[PDB]
Amino acid sequence: GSHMAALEGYRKEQERLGIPYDPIHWSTDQVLHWVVWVMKEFSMTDIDLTTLNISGRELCSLNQEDFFQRVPRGEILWSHLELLRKYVLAS
Numbered sequence: 001g002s003h004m005a006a007l008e009g010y011r012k013e014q015e016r017l018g019i020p021y022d023p024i025h026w027s028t029d030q031v032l033h034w035v036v037w038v039m040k041e042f043s044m045t046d047i048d049l050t051t052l053n054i055s056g057r058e059l060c061s062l063n064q065e066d067f068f069q070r071v072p073r074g075e076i077l078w079s080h081l082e083l084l085r086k087y088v089l090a091s
Contacts, residue, residue, distance in 0.1 A: 006080040021088035026056030047074050
């Protein structure tokens, strides 16, 4: 996507905290800083946090399916996530 709304939202939250743009380098907290913050912008709220309580290498290494079983309603998350790792030239 080319939507800066979600991007500037979380990226303004990332550079201020050191949070990596690319999902694989996230630490367990930042993995869910993303899930909490980004569940906020689209008023998701009830997406499985405790099921994604892993590090970035775990998050980025699982296919959409492994996520969609843990939590199927997080399509919008991944969408912004593509845009994250795309729109930094990968951190």
